[PDB]
Ligand binder design. Sequence first.
Ligand code: HEM
Length: 402
Amino acid sequence: TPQTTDAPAFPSNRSCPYQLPDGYAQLRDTPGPLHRVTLYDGRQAWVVTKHEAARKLLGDPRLSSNRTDDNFPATSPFFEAVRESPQAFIGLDPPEHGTRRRMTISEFTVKRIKGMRPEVEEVVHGFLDEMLAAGPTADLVSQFALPVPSMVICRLLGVPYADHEFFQDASKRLVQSTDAQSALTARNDLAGYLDGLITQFQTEPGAGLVGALVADQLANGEIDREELISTAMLLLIAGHETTASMTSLSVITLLDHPEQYAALRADRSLVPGAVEELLRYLAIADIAGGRVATADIEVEGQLIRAGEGVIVVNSIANRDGTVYEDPDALDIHRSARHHLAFGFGVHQCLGQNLARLELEVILNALMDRVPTLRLAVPVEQLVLRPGTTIQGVNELPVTWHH
Ligand code: HEM
């Protein structure tokens, strides 16, 4: 009995850190902007598998971001936790979405990211000093990839870095949770911590975004205390986990393309372009594109009906050969313009330029301070996270010149 299905199981896991899962390359190859998939609980949904339809759909207000909707395309138990938990603005639609997002934008402006560059370099070179002095081998993840953006986002938010063991652990448990209870637990841990910080700030105003939200919006009744907790938690978790994942994966990927990595070292003006290429190619938040239709939507002769789930899969859309010639080839010299690693439209990544600055600084610093960096293990021995979470590795053994 043939087992071929026209709604394959989704998501799928990467077998190579920088290549689409076999299932996804297949989805990519099927003509038409949309394909049926079967989600973990048996329910069916659409995935968007082409670049222009991804942009169009991400821009269509008929696709809601409400993750508490009964028909939201839950991809794992994490989403069961999401569905019964309070929502940050990532799960809101206009006009509510804008009123919350605009409370946070001031920290992420181009001018502000510019003026973070000296601070990001200090943090990066700080953790490099320590790692290089500490041993001849290291886990790049715990010793460098994670602490750097952790310290940077903590200062932006006004979250004390002194508490980093606690909130880094809770962030991991939440984002990488495989069951709903573990996710709810990690969320509750972070929420109680952030609640304490809020009270503290009400007594003694504090620095950072959390400090400003407490002194301004909360005091005016413009945000709920619970919403402020959700907002700070989103930025705190996004701020840690995304750039950390890009760092480890970029290192693995560049070391597998030595000719391009050498070109990069020889001409640092190539770094911003290389960062855009690595973003396109690694697409680490590739299912952070879930939606539910609130009205019927016609998509090139296919119909998304009201109440149906839609996942905009940006890793697949980033490998659209009609936009990126030889899409599965890493090319730090290509134009990776218009890529969807950060989404598109009203929910386009708030932190995108912070992430870009961090990755530029990091790559330049590794090339400068540790040009002999190499993996301490074969790529094959690394353990990749599953396709239900942010892509990456939890451990990355590295070594360098003895
Ligand atoms: C390092 C690479 C990063 C990638 C690939 C990435 C990816 C994405 C994607 C695909 C979305 C769209 C979600 C959707 O449409 O539902 C998003 C939204 C978001 N990101 Fe990023 N992100 C990154 C870094 C960051 C950083 C460093 C922050 C710091 C706070 C951040 C904060 C956010 C927030 C708050 C949203 C929600 C935006 C909204 O709903 O209006 N991200 N991200």
